[PDB]
Amino acid sequence: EKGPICWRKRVKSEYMRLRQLKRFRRADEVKSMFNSNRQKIQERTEILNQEWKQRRIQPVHIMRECSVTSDLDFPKQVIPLKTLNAVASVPIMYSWSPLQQNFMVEDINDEIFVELVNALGQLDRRDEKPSDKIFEAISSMFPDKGTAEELKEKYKETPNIDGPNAKSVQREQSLHSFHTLFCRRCFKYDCFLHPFHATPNTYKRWSGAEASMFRVLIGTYYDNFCAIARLIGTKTCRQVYEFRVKVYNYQPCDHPRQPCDNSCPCVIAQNFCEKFCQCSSECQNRFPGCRCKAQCNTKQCPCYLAVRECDPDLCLTCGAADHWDSKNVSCKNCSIQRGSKKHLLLAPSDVAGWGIFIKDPVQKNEFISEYCGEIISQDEADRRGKVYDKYMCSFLFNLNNDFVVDATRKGNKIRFANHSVNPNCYAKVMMVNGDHRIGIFAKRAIQTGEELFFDYRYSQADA
Amino acid sequence: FKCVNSLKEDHNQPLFGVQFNWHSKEGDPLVFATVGSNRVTLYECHSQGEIRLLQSYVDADADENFYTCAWTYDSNTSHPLLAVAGSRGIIRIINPITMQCIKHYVGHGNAINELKFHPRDPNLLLSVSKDHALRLWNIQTDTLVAIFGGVEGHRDEVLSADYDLLGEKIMSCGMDHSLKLWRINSKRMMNAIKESYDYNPNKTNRPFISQKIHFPDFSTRDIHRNYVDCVRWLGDLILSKSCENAIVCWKPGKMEDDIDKIKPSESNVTILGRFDYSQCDIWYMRFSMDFWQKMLALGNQVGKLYVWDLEVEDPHKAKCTTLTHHKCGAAIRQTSFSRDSSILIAVCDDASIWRWDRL
Amino acid sequence: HNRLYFHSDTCLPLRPQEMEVDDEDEKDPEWLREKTITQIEEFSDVNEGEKEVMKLWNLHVMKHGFIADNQMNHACMLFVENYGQKIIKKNLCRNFMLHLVSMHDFNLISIMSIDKAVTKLREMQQKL
Numbered sequence A: 001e002k003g004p005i006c007w008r009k010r011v012k013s014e015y016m017r018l019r020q021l022k023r024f025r026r027a028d029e030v031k032s033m034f035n036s037n038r039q040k041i042q043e044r045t046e047i048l049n050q051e052w053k054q055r056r057i058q059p060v061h062i063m064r065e066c067s068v069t070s071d072l073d074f075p076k077q078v079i080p081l082k083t084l085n086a087v088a089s090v091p092i093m094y095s096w097s098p099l100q101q102n103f104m105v106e107d108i109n110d111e112i113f114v115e116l117v118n119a120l121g122q123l124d125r126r127d128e129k130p131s132d133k134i135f136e137a138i139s140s141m142f143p144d145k146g147t148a149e150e151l152k153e154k155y156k157e158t159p160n161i162d163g164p165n166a167k168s169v170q171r172e173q174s175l176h177s178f179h180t181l182f183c184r185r186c187f188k189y190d191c192f193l194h195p196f197h198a199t200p201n202t203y204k205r206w207s208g209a210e211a212s213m214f215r216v217l218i219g220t221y222y223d224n225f226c227a228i229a230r231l232i233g234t235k236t237c238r239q240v241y242e243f244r245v246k247v248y249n250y251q252p253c254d255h256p257r258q259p260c261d262n263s264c265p266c267v268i269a270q271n272f273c274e275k276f277c278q279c280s281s282e283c284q285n286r287f288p289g290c291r292c293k294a295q296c297n298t299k300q301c302p303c304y305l306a307v308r309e310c311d312p313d314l315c316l317t318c319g320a321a322d323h324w325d326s327k328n329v330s331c332k333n334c335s336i337q338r339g340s341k342k343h344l345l346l347a348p349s350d351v352a353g354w355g356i357f358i359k360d361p362v363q364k365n366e367f368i369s370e371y372c373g374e375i376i377s378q379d380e381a382d383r384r385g386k387v388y389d390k391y392m393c394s395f396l397f398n399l400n401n402d403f404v405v406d407a408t409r410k411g412n413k414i415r416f417a418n419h420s421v422n423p424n425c426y427a428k429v430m431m432v433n434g435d436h437r438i439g440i441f442a443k444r445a446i447q448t449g450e451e452l453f454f455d456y457r458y459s460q461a462d463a
Numbered sequence B: 001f002k003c004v005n006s007l008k009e010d011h012n013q014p015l016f017g018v019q020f021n022w023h024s025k026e027g028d029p030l031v032f033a034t035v036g037s038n039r040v041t042l043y044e045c046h047s048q049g050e051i052r053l054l055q056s057y058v059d060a061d062a063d064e065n066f067y068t069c070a071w072t073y074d075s076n077t078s079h080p081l082l083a084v085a086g087s088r089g090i091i092r093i094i095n096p097i098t099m100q101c102i103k104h105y106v107g108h109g110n111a112i113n114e115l116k117f118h119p120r121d122p123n124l125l126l127s128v129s130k131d132h133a134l135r136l137w138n139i140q141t142d143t144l145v146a147i148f149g150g151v152e153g154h155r156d157e158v159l160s161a162d163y164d165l166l167g168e169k170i171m172s173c174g175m176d177h178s179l180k181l182w183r184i185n186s187k188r189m190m191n192a193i194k195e196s197y198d199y200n201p202n203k204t205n206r207p208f209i210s211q212k213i214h215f216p217d218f219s220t221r222d223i224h225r226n227y228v229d230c231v232r233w234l235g236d237l238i239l240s241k242s243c244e245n246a247i248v249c250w251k252p253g254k255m256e257d258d259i260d261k262i263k264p265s266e267s268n269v270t271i272l273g274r275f276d277y278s279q280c281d282i283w284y285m286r287f288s289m290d291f292w293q294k295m296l297a298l299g300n301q302v303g304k305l306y307v308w309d310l311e312v313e314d315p316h317k318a319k320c321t322t323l324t325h326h327k328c329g330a331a332i333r334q335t336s337f338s339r340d341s342s343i344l345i346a347v348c349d350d351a352s353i354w355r356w357d358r359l
Numbered sequence C: 001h002n003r004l005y006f007h008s009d010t011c012l013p014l015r016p017q018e019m020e021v022d023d024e025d026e027k028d029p030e031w032l033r034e035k036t037i038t039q040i041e042e043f044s045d046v047n048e049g050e051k052e053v054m055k056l057w058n059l060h061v062m063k064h065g066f067i068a069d070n071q072m073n074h075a076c077m078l079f080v081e082n083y084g085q086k087i088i089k090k091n092l093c094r095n096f097m098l099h100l101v102s103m104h105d106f107n108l109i110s111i112m113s114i115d116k117a118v119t120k121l122r123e124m125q126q127k128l
């Protein structure tokens, strides 16, 4: 009770006071530190100037011609012009980071608002001689910072389990950070390749530290408290018993109680369902894998035929799933996923700029390297190609209808391979455990030390 | 300050760099050096404004175009050395006592925009480039100690850099609006320096291993709103300029935050105030200070040359004098105080040199 | 073979005692690691406790570079061997368990694993 005109006048008088108060605080805070900064100089510069006193550096002395004049009538000087003998430069290259696998890229304050409130607050108190007529005045003077309500509570103003504050919670709340933030596909947390969050179905098959670990372990173990105990640590085949009673990109499909028919994303997108899909195991659209015995580099093998590498979890027989030891293995069709690239050498091109040379021979159709870079939306590639055209240059390469791989900022050494309409290498995009990747393959045999080329034009027909 | 001479080199090309030799003995004459076109030129300063031409070099290649230089010495010989470089992305170390080009370094994949030697180790050369990277060389053992850049380095041309007084940290600036802190007193870096001194090629078949430091110890795009083209430390505070016609004085972190505790994810900057001036909104115009860091001088796109006195407190009341002269109308690209602050050389877009004297 | 080759990461020329510019046998190039442990720390949304395990797991999965579902079991056994000390010392045993259980709900490891590992860890904690 003082009248709205009055209160809003106070808001202004007070805010304008605090602000001006804090203005001076900092005014000095700065003055303070410019000084305590100066001493720092003095004390250090002296250290340098000492070191320099110790030293005894020879004076520079006087020596095709060069002259120098003087727009102040001083005598023209003339002197011998020495030539520094030529040095060779190398071609232009901008900074890049090394990749071995694609990498995905996407496309009045609170602190004072409170002081003013408590300022106002003390006057409403000092009246008698957290009010509501106050939040209204502040809303009048800063109608943008919100209304009375929105300020009425702005003012008023994810556990851990190894630490002391481990609440007792749901099981789906102890495993939350893990469930959402983990890639069933690369087995990494917050992976660098897969932005879409895993559907719910992709992860289903005392003190809190104890109650939680309980409500969690029962989800996995259920009623075998013999084990629920062994794990929970300090409880018993009993006590737990007692606590008891109280070309389109691929993305996995998750349509429960729906068959993979004409409404399924994978079938619409013209892709095979993969292991990562949450559909039946009977699914008619899953890719079987091959039962080859070895090789897998011909139309004989269904995987190669369908332009897929073998899958280490379906092609159990060709050698693709064993021997995580060598990159030479029975199955010649998993060079990308295991990453068995050939040694490459970088030297100035024989045509232009930088080029790339293979170090050891290579048969027709043999794999040479993956072409790696950042995965970006078709729109990012737009935006970026505007900046790129300046250079009459481009290291964009279509991956599929949804993604482009751009080797400008990051990639691997096969990006130094130059364009030609008469290449000795070619690019084939393959599906590889649910990822489209670009494999660079030789087009004819190739010998020690040859320069590598492929025809950038097809990698540019995303028509 | 009074203007007391003005020189013109015969080539009529912009002079981007000028640097007094701050290693001269007490008693030896004040020598400074100039780069522009494809030339490096030394000058001895004498009394009554006389400036005496000492030496001058020209690059065999006609399309070289030197933007910067820096003075160091050879510990074991007491000879000055002048490093220079420019658009061909090549460093030369010139030995003026002998008139040779004694070393050179190919490596940067584009133009070098600045060069700075280590405050306390004559042999560590930092080079800033249009390839988006810094690079720290060890010029005794001829080894590339470190490339500062990568996934969290500069997204665009790096225009400038500076060691702090003691040689512990570097800050860099460039066309992406960013300034960056790179420590070189981490165990990794000091270890790479030591290791670099040990490298003996004649005793191994393996190329020295260069540190790829992909991550700055601190970053910000919040001081200026445009390419940043000069930066130098003032103590543990930082001075930096863009084209918005003001040198800004700021520190990383919050006001009381200590430069050595600032964490690589700190997202606060604190602006301590700025120096105002006008008509300097073309890019690539650099400032400087004394060895004692009491004087700050900046030149103009139209021949003006400002000099502030850093001794005061606030930037606002910063003592500023504006040196001017009827004949100096060229843009000033860079300035340089003799070590004893007695002299002030400025160089211009038109080959001109202007010498100012104190008292 | 008769030509002048340069290291792809510095552009310095190759002295003859090479060939070999595989300064990118970097299965897990250093920056990708630093990048990942930085990105995890950026969540205001995750205990320092579930972070340090996510960080360590990722570094682990990156170093060896598993690629198949049928490697996960051996990978957990490997995780605890190589990173077991730290999990203990840094007080990250329970979180590590919520990891092991999550990896089950995702259908990667077996139940005989999800404790055959918890065993080997305490069997290691006491070793100190």
Ligand SMILES: Cc1cc(C)c(CN2CCc3c(Cl)cc(-c4c(C)noc4C)c(Cl)c3C2=O)c(=O)[nH]1
Pocket: A091, A092, A093, A094, A352, A353, A354, A355, A387, A388, A391, A393, A394, A395, A408, A415, A416, A417, A418, A419
């Ligand atoms: C086959 C082959 C591949 C590569 C990568 C090089 C080296 N090189 C050529 C020159 C070049 C320009 Cl003119 C502009 C950019 C550039 C920036 C910077 N931002 O977008 C682009 C686009 C970049 Cl990256 C480069 C670059 O690195 C080579 O010589 N040959």
Ligand SMILES: [Zn+2]
Pocket: A183, A185, A186, A187, A191, A192, A193, A194
């Ligand atoms: Zn992923």
Ligand SMILES: [Zn+2]
Pocket: A253, A254, A255, A259, A260, A261, A264, A265, A266, A267, A273, A277, A279
């Ligand atoms: Zn489906």
Ligand SMILES: [Zn+2]
Pocket: A252, A253, A266, A272, A273, A274, A277, A278, A279
């Ligand atoms: Zn599917």
Ligand SMILES: [Zn+2]
Pocket: A253, A260, A273, A277, A279, A280, A283, A284, A285, A286
């Ligand atoms: Zn299906």
Ligand SMILES: [Zn+2]
Pocket: A290, A291, A292, A295, A296, A301, A302, A303, A304, A310, A315, A318
């Ligand atoms: Zn097969």
Ligand SMILES: [Zn+2]
Pocket: A289, A290, A291, A296, A303, A304, A309, A310, A311, A315, A318, A320
């Ligand atoms: Zn197969």
Ligand SMILES: [Zn+2]
Pocket: A290, A292, A294, A295, A296, A310, A315, A318, A319, A320, A331, A332, A333
């Ligand atoms: Zn196969």
